Paper text:
(vii) +DQH2+antimycin A: with DQH2 and antimycin A. When antimycin A was added with DQH2, the Rieske domain did not occupy the b position. Also, increased heterogeneity was not observed in cyt b when antimycin A was added in combination with atovaquone or decylubiquinol.
Numbering used by the authors:
A (entry chain N): 1 to 55
B (entry chain M): 15 to 416
C (entry chain L): 26 to 248, 260 to 474
D (entry chain P): 39 to 101
E (entry chain G), F (entry chain R): 2 to 125
G (entry chain C): 111 to 383
Amino acid sequence: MALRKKNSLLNMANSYVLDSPQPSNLNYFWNFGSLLALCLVIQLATGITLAMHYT
Amino acid sequence: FSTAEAAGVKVAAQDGQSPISDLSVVLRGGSRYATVPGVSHILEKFAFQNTVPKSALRFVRELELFGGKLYTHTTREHIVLRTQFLKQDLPYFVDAFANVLKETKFQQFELTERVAPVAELDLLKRESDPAFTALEAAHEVAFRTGLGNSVYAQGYSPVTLEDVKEFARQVYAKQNVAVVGNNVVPADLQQLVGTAFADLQEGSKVTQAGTTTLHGGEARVRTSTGNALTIALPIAEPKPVYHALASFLGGPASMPWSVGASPLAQATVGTHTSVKATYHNYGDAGLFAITIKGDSPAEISQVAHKAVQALKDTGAEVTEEQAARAYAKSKFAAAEAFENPDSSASVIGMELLSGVSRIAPENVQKFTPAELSEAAAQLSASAKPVVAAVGQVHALPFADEL
Amino acid sequence: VSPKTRTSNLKNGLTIASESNPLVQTATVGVWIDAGSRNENAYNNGTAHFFEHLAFKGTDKRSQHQLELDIENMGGHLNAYTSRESTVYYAKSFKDDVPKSVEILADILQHSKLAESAIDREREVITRELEEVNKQYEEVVFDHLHATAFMNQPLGRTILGPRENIQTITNTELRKFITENYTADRMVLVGAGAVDHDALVELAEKYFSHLPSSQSPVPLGTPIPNFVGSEVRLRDDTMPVAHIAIAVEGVSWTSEDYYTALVAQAIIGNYDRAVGTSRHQGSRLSNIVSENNLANSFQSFSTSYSDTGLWGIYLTSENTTQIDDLVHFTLKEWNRLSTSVSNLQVERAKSQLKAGLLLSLDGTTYVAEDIGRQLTTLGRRVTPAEVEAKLEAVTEHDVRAWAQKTLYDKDIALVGLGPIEGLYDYNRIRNDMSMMRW
Amino acid sequence: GKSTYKIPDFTPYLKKDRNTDANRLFSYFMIGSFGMLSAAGAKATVQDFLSNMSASADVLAMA
Amino acid sequence: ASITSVVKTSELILKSPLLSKIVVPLAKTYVKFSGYRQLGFKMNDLIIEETPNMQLALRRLPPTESYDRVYRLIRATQFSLSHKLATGNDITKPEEDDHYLIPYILDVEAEAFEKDALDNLEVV
Amino acid sequence: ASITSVVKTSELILKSPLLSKIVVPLAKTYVKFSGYRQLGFKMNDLIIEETPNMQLALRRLPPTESYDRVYRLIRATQFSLSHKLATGNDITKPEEDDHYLIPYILDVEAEAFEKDALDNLEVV
Amino acid sequence: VLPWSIGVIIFLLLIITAFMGYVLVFGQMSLWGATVICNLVSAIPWLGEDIVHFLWGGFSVGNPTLQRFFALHYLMPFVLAVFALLHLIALHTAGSSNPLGITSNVDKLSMHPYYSFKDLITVFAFLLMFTLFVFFSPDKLGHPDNYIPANPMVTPASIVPEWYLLPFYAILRAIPDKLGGVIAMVAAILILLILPIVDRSIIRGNAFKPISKLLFGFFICNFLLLGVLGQVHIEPPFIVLGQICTIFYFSYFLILLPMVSTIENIFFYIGSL
Ligand code: HEM
Ligand code: HEM
Ligand SMILES: CCCCCCCCCCCCO[C@@H]1O[C@H](CO)[C@@H](O[C@H]2O[C@H](CO)[C@@H](O)[C@H](O)[C@H]2O)[C@H](O)[C@H]1O
Ligand SMILES: CCCCCCCCCCCCO[C@@H]1O[C@H](CO)[C@@H](O[C@H]2O[C@H](CO)[C@@H](O)[C@H](O)[C@H]2O)[C@H](O)[C@H]1O
């Protein structure tokens, strides 16, 4: 068995970002979910940085 | 094959001009001698498991370094363990056989995890052919015990480690062991076997529990995996004329995309079935069998009637042409049997263990039309016909219909 | 040391090649032809196979019945097979029945009746076989493998041919095929077992002397294939066993990497759960597969043609949820042929092959097949000494160099049949042809 | 239509030189360029962004 | 550490007269103060089992040994949670403290170690 | 909404001469503009299947109907991802748009609804 | 091994979280503890000084440092909660171990109600301890100097870390070299990662191992003594004592546990023959 499937932590990541079975016909409107993840990552990175300088 | 004796073990070897040698140990340990159903199959599968000097694993890894191969099989008469290797590697192979016969550790885990699972897959693969099943069932009806024991281990009759250990104590003994070397220098083999198998027990000759008794009857085996029918006739006096009879009657084709000029091959015409006449000499007894496999049970029923008629027609009279054909085909059969190492080993094995001098292919007797017709007449008029149906048994013939 | 293979020619250019054995009493004599289904076009595809049927349907003199009787009277059997590049017609007989069997072969090859009635009778037979090959899973897989690997090329066509051609093949097309292709310079009369070479050459002069020579006689085993990375999926959820083949473009018979490819193939090797010894094999893939129950079997192959080949593996598995693991570990073992193999693996595989290449030649038929194959593909029988030397010359450096050019990061042809839902898409399989860590 | 050995037509898509090193090298040039710009863009981003943590102009003025 | 290592080192010690004379009494007192017998365990019941090798050796135990081991684990677990010690027949006597598992694990490990060696063989 | 509801309401409409005269032409135009036939679907291929009732009705389909439905879904998925429409024989003709599934789901739902009614029966 | 290894990271995250939180008060100990601890980074060769100025956001601990410590102190507990969850997901594959060291697959109990109600007992015992400190002695565990506002001019009499960091501080002091001391202090935590290797026992845990139990007792008491030595003055004879205790701390992992666990294996086997 591949490590990505055997190890429980790796297997959780595997289940969402790698082996996750998706329909083969998603159009570009299925891209907003990962754009929302990107906005969230930018807000966390910029927001925590602003918090270091904000009073 | 120069027969000799080396430290109480019978050794037969024939030198050749090839880089590859075959060494076979033939054991008097086939299923007719089995103490428990299936033990001779399990013992065969236990060869080259862990021994005290050398684990199964180490043996296989070393065998790969020599590029050798290992073949084993069980018959009603023998267990045959054969190795094929380059000529010069002979001493290694003799020593490996000695380790197996003297020092096999028969461990319970090997039986559960290694040996019994392999024995079970072996049987399932053979049974995929319904003709195999039909001919096995026919031996069971015809002889009941001894020759009627199953050759292979079945799930319904579990072999225990104590069963296999007891049987091996009898079989792995100088009295039951013959060594057969193809393309092996005979003097070199005798010297090696003499040093390696010196400390093997003497033991005693394994005997069949009970005398061979002949019976008639039916065996309907319901499978969903194809259809076959054996029409067997147990013989109390096995004659070599039945060899010529089987070859004459025939069943298969001798060229591609053809039926064949044989009586039984001309019984399949218009169907998708296949016939095969087979004589099984077993020393004290014999079995002449006509196995018909096919897809449609009705087609089999048709050919089965033509098969029985063909035998009766033969019994009436055969021509000189037919007699010459029988002899030609029987001589060819003998030749290729003595050639194929699987069967070669057992032929000399029977000469060494039992005493039955081999019949050279060049000494195959020519039977006159009279002798062939008389042999067929003796079969058509048997008091104990065996019929074994496999598959859709409700649609296959019965003994009383045939 | 086996006896020398004797070789003679006739005037027309027919080769006679023989290897005698005094111990046997039976002899295989037959005709190996350097022609097959590849020599057909797309309009007569299936002609070679059709002829094989009609060769045993009656000659100018003897009828089908007479033919049957004659062979039965000899006591032996006749057999034939047609592949993509080779056709064989042999006759196993007794020592004394060699001349008569030679006579039968020359007749069926040179003067077959090819009656219209017989053609029509065979049409139905061949049509039935077309819808019966489905059962033989391994054959289905390999026929699709060639079809996809050599997409729209002669090596990608099936031997049986399409249904459409089967209904339209005429005696004219049949006659044309065998007149163009079954020429003396493309044929080898081969004897193995109880044959005298000088006797066989006399029989060849008697029966095969009036064979046509081709206009342009090229040497035996003379051929451009453009491999296509691709996949065929034949999903069938009702089958319990998945059958999967994966191949890359391999090596031709006369490649300089011929033996290196065989050694690489032996490092991966074969496996079968039904054989007792297979759980103890040295092969890394074998150990992974047996310990994890990933497959019922696998068989490495290195198939060669005159100008190309396919090198790969054929797997069978009931473990439908771990097909991904099976394929993953298989391709990771192939990666190691380029990244990790050392003297250890190479010397082990060479040791195994040194024996295996001689071991293959068991009976008289096996020997005859070897002589015939080597004569039609290489133009000569290579002595065991030469083969032992070519194998000895394979180093670990050669295997790594060969794998890095042939396997590493290369396109594969992939065929899956059966419950293959777990087989990932092409990209994920092909991504396993390299290692990001290397 | 029926025979599964007749491969569907892929001629509109197939490259003639599909097996060549030049063919593979081109696609790895695209992958490589993309990796290269992503590495350069990441480095720029990380450097510029993390510099917020270094002394600000008003801190350096009082030094 | 592998069971093989422990068994072989112990055998070296038992061979040496001097060594055995000094080690065997210490080992016997150690085992008395260990106190696993006061929960009705046999020594082999304490061996770590969460490895492939040990899971294989446990599968090879004869069914009766296997059922008795299950009972001793359940019984010790019940003494542990109750903060009680075994009394009477539940205490393991020195003569009952048999190495029922050692032979199975030594065979499993012998194969495993041979496999590792043979994976590294070099044709000479 | 249940398939039962849809089928019964439609049958009320088809009975009324006036209603059918006005509804049937609209329904036929609707189906033309819907454009599911241009991906080679039959109408019943679009019904939501992720319900116990629908999973039961799909299991009851004859194997042939079931295999053909699988193919039409895979074929439509391939047209969707390629942004192509069916051409030629792939387009569903009005005569091929048969209600292969409706009878199975109506039987499943008939049982389900009777079960609900009978669970609420009151002995009089 | 995996839940234990993630656990070691949790412990490091706790230390950083608590260190930054203590600075936020900006009393004397806040400032001076930040100064001394952040100057340990200056020991990193070549770039160390640059890294310190970068951490501080200036040339000493000041406003930039405090505002960044606030933002990071707020964040770090969320990171710590994630790692706590990860170590439990990793554990869930084998389940909890138990005091006998044997399998529990033979005899399992549901988490609720058994361990739910068992956990409530110690929740209330904890709340009683919490009550006695928070309501009756809220400053017992603190340093009075942190009620003086940070003053970069005046240096407090003694700059010591919070009690829970004291053993690591004693280990640092034991090594005379600056970089040496930093490495030893980090190594004192990272060495926990090698326990799965250096423990050679065939048996899990110490319940049945008298010699291991004695060694464990010495190891624990030594760790408490290191803690006490972390807050004494750098004076005789505490200097040499701190070095001996530091050697013993490391020799438990590197020498004593591998030796004792090897010998006990042999004693179990010979003793039960
Ligand atoms: C931080 C905000 C969000 C993030 C990061 C997020 C992320 C995602 C992702 C990655 C997917 C799968 C890929 C995709 O379909 O785009 C998804 C699907 C989905 N999200 Fe969101 N989402 C967010 C907010 C929302 C909101 C506000 C809703 C609803 C009101 C929503 C409802 C759904 C639904 C129903 C799906 C499944 C859609 C489908 O595949 O058919 N999400 N989301
Ligand atoms: C969903 C994520 C977030 C959203 C939508 C969001 C939204 C906003 C908005 C609209 C503002 C006003 C910006 C302006 O006009 O100046 C702001 C300011 C701020 N945010 Fe966030 N924020 C997010 C996450 C965070 C996080 C995680 C932090 C961490 C502390 C943070 C810290 C700040 C700070 C310090 C400010 C004030 C300084 C400024 O205006 O730029 N934010 N945020
Ligand atoms: C930034 C986020 C923080 C870390 C969180 C990581 C991702 C979230 C995972 C939590 C969900 C786990 O919940 C469960 O996990 C298992 C383990 O892979 C997954 O299980 C899924 O994949 C496995 C194999 O890959 C399949 O055998 C299974 O049929 C399928 O359900 C599913 O995802 C979910 O059923
Ligand atoms: C996970 C990452 C771990 C380690 C990474 C270390 C990165 C942290 C280092 C911050 C380095 C800043 O280094 C400094 O950056 C700024 C840009 O930011 C540069 O500044 C330069 O470009 C900027 C715009 O980009 C202009 O305003 C400026 O006029 C010019 O000098 C300096 O030339 C460089 O000295």
